[PDB]
Design an enzyme around this catalytic site. Structure first.
Site, short mmCIF file in Angstrom:
data_model
loop_
_atom_site.label_atom_id
_atom_site.label_comp_id
_atom_site.label_asym_id
_atom_site.label_seq_id
_atom_site.Cartn_x
_atom_site.Cartn_y
_atom_site.Cartn_z
N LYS B 154 0.82 -1.20 0.00
CA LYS B 154 0.00 0.00 0.00
C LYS B 154 0.86 1.26 0.00
O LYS B 154 0.62 2.18 -0.78
CB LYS B 154 -0.93 0.00 1.21
CG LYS B 154 -1.89 -1.14 1.25
CD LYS B 154 -2.94 -0.94 2.32
CE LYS B 154 -2.34 -0.80 3.69
NZ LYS B 154 -1.30 -1.81 3.94
N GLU B 180 0.29 6.03 11.08
CA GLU B 180 1.26 5.14 10.46
C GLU B 180 2.66 5.52 10.92
O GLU B 180 2.86 6.53 11.60
CB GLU B 180 1.17 5.17 8.94
CG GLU B 180 0.10 4.25 8.40
CD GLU B 180 0.58 2.82 8.26
OE1 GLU B 180 0.38 2.03 9.21
OE2 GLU B 180 1.15 2.49 7.20
N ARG B 181 3.63 4.70 10.54
CA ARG B 181 4.97 4.81 11.09
C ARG B 181 5.48 6.24 10.99
O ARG B 181 5.04 7.02 10.15
CB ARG B 181 5.93 3.89 10.35
CG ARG B 181 6.05 2.53 10.94
CD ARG B 181 4.81 1.73 10.68
NE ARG B 181 4.80 1.31 9.29
CZ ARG B 181 5.32 0.18 8.85
NH1 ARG B 181 5.91 -0.66 9.69
NH2 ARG B 181 5.26 -0.10 7.56
N1 LIG Z 1 6.74 -2.60 -6.61
C1 LIG Z 1 7.36 -3.38 -5.70
N2 LIG Z 1 8.44 -4.12 -6.03
C2 LIG Z 1 9.07 -4.90 -5.13
N3 LIG Z 1 8.68 -5.00 -3.85
C3 LIG Z 1 7.62 -4.32 -3.39
C4 LIG Z 1 6.89 -3.44 -4.31
N4 LIG Z 1 5.90 -2.89 -3.60
C5 LIG Z 1 5.99 -3.37 -2.34
N5 LIG Z 1 7.03 -4.21 -2.21
C6 LIG Z 1 7.42 -4.92 -0.98
O1 LIG Z 1 6.59 -4.51 0.10
C7 LIG Z 1 7.35 -3.95 1.16
C8 LIG Z 1 6.74 -2.63 1.57
O2 LIG Z 1 5.42 -2.88 2.00
P1 LIG Z 1 4.49 -1.67 2.44
O3 LIG Z 1 3.73 -1.21 1.24
O4 LIG Z 1 5.31 -0.69 3.23
O5 LIG Z 1 3.46 -2.38 3.43
P2 LIG Z 1 2.04 -1.71 3.66
O6 LIG Z 1 1.39 -1.80 2.31
O7 LIG Z 1 1.41 -2.58 4.71
O8 LIG Z 1 2.37 -0.32 4.10
C9 LIG Z 1 8.76 -3.77 0.67
O9 LIG Z 1 9.68 -4.27 1.63
C10 LIG Z 1 8.84 -4.55 -0.62
O10 LIG Z 1 9.59 -5.75 -0.43
MG LIG Z 2 2.44 1.55 5.22
#
Ligand SMILES: Nc1ncnc2c1ncn2[C@@H]1O[C@H](COP(=O)(O)OP(=O)(O)O)[C@@H](O)[C@H]1O
Ligand SMILES: [Mg+2]
Ligand SMILES: Nc1ncnc2c1ncn2[C@@H]1O[C@H](COP(=O)(O)OP(=O)(O)OP(=O)(O)O)[C@@H](O)[C@H]1O
Ligand SMILES: Nc1ncnc2c1ncn2[C@@H]1O[C@H](COP(=O)(O)OP(=O)(O)OP(=O)(O)O)[C@@H](O)[C@H]1O
Ligand SMILES: [Mg+2]
Ligand SMILES: [Mg+2]
Lengths: 47, 469, 47, 501, 92, 483
Positions: B154, B180-181
């Protein structure tokens, strides 16, 4: 339309703001007499 | 006026007044605090008392402290002087750069635009993302949502939408991080300084920021959403502009409400959520709609506890969106980033009258093929692929090709995958998927379509893969 | 009470992974032969 | 313009009255605890000083728990609540048609004020057991699947149940649009005065909806109540009854109505909030004990009065959202055991391409054969049997070959029928065109035509029948049966047309 | 600890027993006492046969004009302020 | 009596005391009971104060005199705590004498805002081949460790704590990483065994051990993590790096639930109060990486969670998974099928990840990630090969066997790079799958003995130079042939 809407919505506010300062005059006796008459009518029609 | 604190339970303060009570939603300033502590009234317990939720930690509060009624709800600075300035839930700078010198203050608790003001137009938006632009086109000036559990992508996806649309967008923008963080808070801050959207020298910034990151008390995470929403509402109404409003998360808002509901003496609803979940979300998610006075394109990152889309929070939020792009972890663990689920994703402007027959039928062919592939997977698990029909293996190969082709290397994911960011104009996505469905690439390997932009890159990758063979 | 389509993979059980194994058998071998064929094609077009 | 606003001022009611009154003790979460009001009727409209309304819902021995009809930011402990003596009531009539009203019958359309003369309560009782007469007339929804396999007579509650974004509101709006042909014609025994109650939706959605209805010029006979997501809980708990009373006016005035609640699973949530805040005991899933009485006393007003009470009617199409096909949840079963049917929508079918995504296996109608025209009855009996035979052996579809020619025939018939049932969006079809298409489908005049092309045929056939043999269609429609002459003529049209394509 | 609540309640229980209905007259501003005489003599027209009037006057410039009269529960509002907001509501 | 500065107990029971008086008592201030005990005034009701007794309330009776101290709860901090076992309040319990600190610090303090922090850049060497390579951890990063009972989580923690002895005895001070271990809800036996196994590595000269074991009253278990986090925030603020290992956190959530159901606060889901999110977030958001205008300190947090029956979708596991910057999913069937440590890769993310790593290890870990990803796609083939897929299966088996590791035997990063480079360069794809363990051990012994020069070169320059690569390849081949 838009111009008329603006015009009327400003007219209403302007005149009401004029009235809320016009009521500060010295018409108190007329209001009190009218309200006592209203009491007369309500008491009569309340039973 | 001036009341007294009579009770301090958790993060809920009951204040007793002898003068006239302050109406609900007012702001009360607790006196004698090093850092401004602002309560909001939320009830009238009777007997000239009120019960208030505190926007900062209740350490040091002493039964009997004097409390000053502000007079009007929490008022925050707004205007083009809050651009590039991080703000608290109560609009006070947290970037150590001095007060926010403005002229107009706004009160965060406003009313929604009424039915006579709603704008009924809708036209596609181009995010330069294959899956999103194809199966779930984003309406311009329409509420959007990025569902999906934790760790699916996300935040990275919102980073992409910022990176692209923000700069490629004329009007202002706002990012209202709710619960969020904080690491991500300053990561966004620094990334935006690098991009130049925020400048610390001139008044040429384009993005305002608001932060109620999750170290704040629950009282101050249920309202930071309203602070960011107020800033964007001003940029829509008074400035007659186009606004981008990014919220992330907007499930921490309902969670932070749930955290304090019980202390306010309320029976707990279905899954522990407050009884007033739906209406508390409605009174907020209906100050974000586009109106006839201005346009807000609102992208919201909605958590989903334990990837359960049936939970009351997301289940309720589904009714307040135009385009819902449900990220999935089953698809993110195949390496198909963005993780979007091509079948759960939906949009309101996916009607051929608004995207045309070519795009509509390309997308519906894609969805049909993916669903047929799911149907076959039930069979391939008993037989094995060999015993399939001969017309089926074609459909499974096409579905695998499409599924890989919907992935894409993001400009902000250069540090995860080491790839180079790609954008894909809508027409090219349509071309590529038309060709794949028609069979014009049925000879190429599947790994040729993994993490490539336009289809021509797919053919180049197929070459470079066959050379080293 | 009812079922759905494409759930043998969602359950992630034993079959949910044997199915991946089977599909990957087939398409790794197909990718190998397709890569060889594309090589052959370009190495012939050298002429 | 001032010349206009002085008749605005003149047309007022300045008089005062001796009225009862209590004072708020408490407020918060949208629930006032008024004290006093010793002569307040349960479920009565009280008015706060600031201007809001309230519905004195919970008469406790010492205080009356009132539920505010709006943001209570305007209310304070100490305010004055003056009772009005009136149970909640709403305007009715034919002045509403074409307007958009909120839960209390106040035009939220701009577009002038409502000019209704007659008001009517919202907590009336449903007509008894004697007033009703069996359900006999059909309500042409204009949707092939609904109108042939799961029919809907007039006076029948027909749940439309299904997961999110499967096309429930779309079915309801196709139903609304279809009635245009009737509401433009002459006979007053076929005019349906659709109503559409929008609960919990966001004003953007209702705005887009009214835009669709205006484009299709389907507002001149539709009312659109709306208790949208931002309107306080009481105005969503109360919108369905406002709609049902606006419809009861027609029903008991010898007219035919149709009311579409969308959703009811948000009225139930609004009522749950209202109760949990009033502190009434909770129950399963936190719903009170009335969440059955709530709906039941609503979906039991949809009647079909006899010919001594007028002959009116009031259909009902409550839309229900089920969390991932969990038809066993509390509200889905509460509202499935009240209604006369269910049109189940599923998302496996919506993405296989079967749109509208109706699932004829689970969808049933408990009037059945009745509520169809003899023509559609003749066609749909065979169609229903053929589809039932297909479904039970569709599991082999993925093989097809390696099987007996009988099951191969069954699959080759079921596939064509499934593709014939696919329909566009906001393209409802008169009953006789449905009969023509499904006749061409069930009599074998496609078995030799590849499935991928069926849709083409369908559309082509319609255009080739609408513009050529309107006389035959009129013959089928005016007398809703297929006389052997009409049967043979249909056979000839189908055969010769298929030959030339 | 709540003895004062008891006796107070008991007083309200005895007042009504002897029949002294609460009343109240909130005025636009200061009021004469001859006006108060006519006020009492007219409000006595609302009671039943035997009751007594216990009128607690209150001055209020916050309202605009007229007066607000409470009698037991019965509440009659003829303050110009409410007339102004009523008119603005009606003609809006 | 002075009801302003001193109240009297009303109803002590089950750990919570109502106190009549104390009209000038601050919320979450520390009152001293007359019997040496202490408590924290949590509920401030209109009539009486709900205090929680930091101990067993045998000694408290109705009528006792409670008297406030005048200061929000706080704990000693400083360098004087190192190598001490302290109670949840800061009272040594190792019988080594007075703790002797020159500075207190509040527990309910505020995490550093947006501006102080700077991105995470340095590596926090865990010494576990499966973590440094695949799910790396950077300084200033919070990295959950979630797994069922007895899958080797405290093993990860103690390997991390032991490994820092390489650095905490060197000349440099930007590499020194002091450690804090907060034991919530464990046994006294387990904590004593842990301290004994730490002392056997002389890793207590730079460690603190806060201990709120099973017997200690619920408030102490609720307050141990904050005490530890404050003792670590001291180092973070003062420009020295730090670490902290809450073990476990689910036990803190349980302690809080008890403490809050006895104050009569209503329950929420699973009977937990509504705030069990604001309980951990408040705590974990303190693990920062301050910029260079604030010292450059740091505080890595390693919360440990125990899921019930491998149920990551429970309440508290998903409350913490959404708070931290990654995961280390210990699987309890990888733990039997052979893989120890049971770290489950593919599910173990590090949302910071690569930027933290060291270039030398990045060179090989990048390739290892892809090789293992393919191997895990096609490792479901025991059910039944092609040349390429056969090679992939063999290579994956080799790398998996390489990841396995002993217990309390962390290995330097240069040695990890040596082994991983050997494995990922194809200089193993002929050895028997079960020979990998003995080969790896012998290779360690060799390269440690003779080629300290090459390992030192990699360690100092931080990357595998081309000359470094050549010499490494020569050693690997000359040994394999010598194997
Ligand atoms: N386009 C992408 N390519 C590679 N990895 C991705 C991509 N989008 C997300 N990720 C993976 O997701 C992680 C980040 O997730 P994040 O979006 O921060 O979690 P949330 O959606 O719960 O906030 C990264 O460590 C990465 O490994
Ligand atoms: Mg997040
Ligand atoms: N007959 C049809 N043909 C093609 N598409 C359709 C059809 N019916 C519905 N859809 C599609 O389904 C989508 C959802 O439609 P609709 O809003 O009617 O379902 P819904 O369940 O009411 O949605 P929600 O539950 O979110 O209110 C629309 O975008 C529409 O394009
Ligand atoms: N890498 C490893 N190699 C061999 N054995 C190991 C390894 N890691 C852990 N173990 C074994 O697993 C056992 C339990 O591990 P440990 O107690 O560290 O996990 P834990 O889940 O924290 O325990 P608990 O949850 O009961 O506190 C230990 O006895 C240890 O010997
Ligand atoms: Mg709908
Ligand atoms: Mg352990």
């Amino acid at each position: 339309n838009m111009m008329r809407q603006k015009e009327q919505e400003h007219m209403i506010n302007w005149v009401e703001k004029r009235v809320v300062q016009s009521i500060s005059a010295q018409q108190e006796k007329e209001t009190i007499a009218k309200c006592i008459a209203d009491l007369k009518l309500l008491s009569k029609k309340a039973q | 006026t001036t009341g007294r604190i009579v009770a301090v339970i958790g993060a809920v303060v009951d204040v007793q007044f002898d003068e006239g009570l302050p109406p609900i939603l007012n702001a009360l300033e607790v006196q004698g605090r090093e850092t401004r502590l602002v309560l909001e009234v939320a009830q009238h317990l009777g007997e000239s008392t009120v019960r208030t939720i505190a926007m900062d930690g209740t350490e040091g509060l002493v039964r009997g402290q004097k409390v000053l009624d502000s007079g009007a709800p929490i008022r925050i600075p707004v205007g083009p002087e809050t651009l590039g300035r991080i703000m608290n839930v109560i609009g006070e700078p947290i970037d150590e750069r001095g007060p926010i010198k403005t002229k107009q203050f706004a009160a965060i608790h406003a009313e929604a635009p009424e039915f006579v003001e709603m704008s009924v137009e809708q036209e596609i938006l181009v995010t330069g993302i294959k899956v999103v632009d194809l199966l779930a086109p984003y309406a311009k000036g329409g509420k959007i949502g990025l569902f999906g559990g934790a760790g699916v992508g996300k935040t990275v996806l919102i980073m992409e939408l910022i990176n692209n649309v923000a700069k490629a967008h004329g009007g202002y923008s706002v990012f209202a991080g709710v619960g969020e963080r904080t690491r991500e808070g300053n990561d966004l801050y620094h990334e935006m300084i690098e991009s130049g959207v925020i400048n610390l020298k001139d008044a040429t910034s384009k993005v305002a920021l608001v932060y109620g990151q999750m170290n704040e008390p629950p009282g101050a995470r249920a309202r930071v959403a309203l602070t960011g929403l107020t800033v964007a509402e001003y940029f829509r109404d008074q400035e007659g502009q186009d606004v981008l409003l990014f919220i992330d998360n907007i499930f921490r808002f309902t969670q932070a409400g749930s955290e304090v509901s019980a202390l306010l003496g309320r029976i707990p609803s279905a899954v522990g959520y407050q009884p007033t979940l739906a209406t508390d979300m409605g009174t907020m998610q209906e100050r974000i709609t586009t109106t006839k006075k201005g346009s807000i394109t609102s992208v919201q990152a909605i958590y989903v506890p334990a990837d359960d889309l049936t939970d009351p929070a997301p289940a309720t939020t589904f009714a307040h969106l135009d385009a819902t792009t449900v990220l999935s972890r089953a698809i993110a663990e195949l390496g198909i980033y963005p993780a979007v689920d091509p079948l759960d994703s939906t949009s309101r402007i996916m009607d051929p009258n608004i995207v045309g027959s070519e795009h509509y039928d390309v997308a519906r062919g894609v969805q049909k093929i993916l669903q047929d592939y799911k149907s076959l997977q039930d069979i391939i698990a008993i037989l094995g692929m060999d015993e399939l029909s001969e017309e089926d293996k074609l459909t499974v190969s096409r579905a695998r090709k499409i599924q890989r082709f919907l992935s894409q290397p993001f400009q902000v994911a250069e540090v995860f995958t080491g790839h180079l960011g790609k954008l894909v104009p809508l027409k090219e996505t349509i071309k590529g998927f038309q060709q794949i469905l028609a069979g014009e690439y049925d000879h190429l390997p599947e790994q040729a379509f993994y993490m490539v932009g336009p289809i021509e890159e797919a053919v180049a990758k197929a070459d470079k893969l066959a050379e080293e063979h | 009470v009812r079922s759905s389509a494409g759930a043998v993979r969602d359950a992630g059980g034993a079959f949910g992974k044997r199915e991946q194994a089977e599909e990957e058998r087939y398409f790794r071998a197909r990718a190998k032969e397709q890569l060889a064929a594309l090589k052959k094609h370009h190495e012939n077009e050298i002429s | 313009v001032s010349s206009i606003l002085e008749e605005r001022i003149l047309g007022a009611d300045t008089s005062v009255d001796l009225e009862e009154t209590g004072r708020v003790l408490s407020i918060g979460d949208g629930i006032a605890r008024v004290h006093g009001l010793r002569n307040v009727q349960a479920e009565e409209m009280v008015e706060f000083s600031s201007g809001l309304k309230g519905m004195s819902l919970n008469l406790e021995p010492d205080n009356v728990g009132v539920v505010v009809f709006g943001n209570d930011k305007l209310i304070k402990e100490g305010d004055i609540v003056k009772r009005t003596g009136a149970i909640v009531d709403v305007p009715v009539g034919e002045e509403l048609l074409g307007r958009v009203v909120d839960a209390l019958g106040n035009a939220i359309d701009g577009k002038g004020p409502i000019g209704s003369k007659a008001r009517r309560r919202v907590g009336l009782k449903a007509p008894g057991i004697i007033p009703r007469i069996s359900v006999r007339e059909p309500m042409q929804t204009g949707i092939k699947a609904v109108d042939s396999l799961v029919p809907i007579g007039r006076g029948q509650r027909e749940l439309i149940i299904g997961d999110r974004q499967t096309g429930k509101t779309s079915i309801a709006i196709d139903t609304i649009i279809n009635q245009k042909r009737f509401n433009d014609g002459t006979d007053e025994k076929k005019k349906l005065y659709c109503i559409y109650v929008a609960i919990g939706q966001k004003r953007s959605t209702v705005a887009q909806l009214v835009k669709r209805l205006t484009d299709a010029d389907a507002m001149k006979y539709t009312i659109v109540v709306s208790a949208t997501a931002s309107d306080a809980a009481p105005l969503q708990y109360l919108a369905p009854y406002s709609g049902c009373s606006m419809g009861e006016y027609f029903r008991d005035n010898g007219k035919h109505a149709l009311i579409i609640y969308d959703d009811l699973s948000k009225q139930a949530v609004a009522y749950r909030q209202m109760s949990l805040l009033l502190r009434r005991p909770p129950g399963r899933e936190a719903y009170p004990g009335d969440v059955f009485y709530l709906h039941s006393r609503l979906l039991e007003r949809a009647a079909k009065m006899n010919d001594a009470f007028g002959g009116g009617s009031l259909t009902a199409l409550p839309v229900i959202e089920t969390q991932a096909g969990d038809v066993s949840a509390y509200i889905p079963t509460n509202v499935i055991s009240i209604t006369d049917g269910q049109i189940f929508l599923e998302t496996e079918l919506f993405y296989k391409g079967i749109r509208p995504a109706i699932n004829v296996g689970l969808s049933v109608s408990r009037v059945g054969s009745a509520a169809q025209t003899r023509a559609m009855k003749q066609v749909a009996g065979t169609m229903k049997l053929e589809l039932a035979q297909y479904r039970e052996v569709a599991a082999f579809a993925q093989f097809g070959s390696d099987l007996d020619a009988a099951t191969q025939q069954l699959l080759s018939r079921g596939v064509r029928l499934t593709e014939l049932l696919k329909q566009g969006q906001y393209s409802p079809m008169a009953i006789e065109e449905q009969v023509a298409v499904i006749y061409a489908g069930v009599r074998g005049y496609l078995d030799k035509l590849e499935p991928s092309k069926i849709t083409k045929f369908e559309n082509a056939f319609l255009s080739h029948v609408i513009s050529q043999h309107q006389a035959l269609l009129g013959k089928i429609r005016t007398d809703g049966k297929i006389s052997e002459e009409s049967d043979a003529k249909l056979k000839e049209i189908v055969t010769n047309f298929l030959a030339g394509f | 600890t709540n003895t004062p609540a008891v006796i107070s309640a008991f007083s309200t229980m005895m007042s009504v027993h002897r029949g002294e209905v609460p009343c109240t007259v909130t005025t636009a501003s200061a009021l004469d006492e001859a006006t108060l005489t006519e006020l009492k003599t007219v409000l006595k027209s609302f009671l039943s046969k035997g009751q007594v009037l216990k009128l607690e006057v209150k001055i209020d410039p916050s309202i605009m004009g007229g007066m607000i009269v409470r009698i037991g529960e019965k509440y009659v509002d003829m303050s110009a302020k409410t007339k102004i907001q009523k008119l603005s509501r009606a003609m809006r």
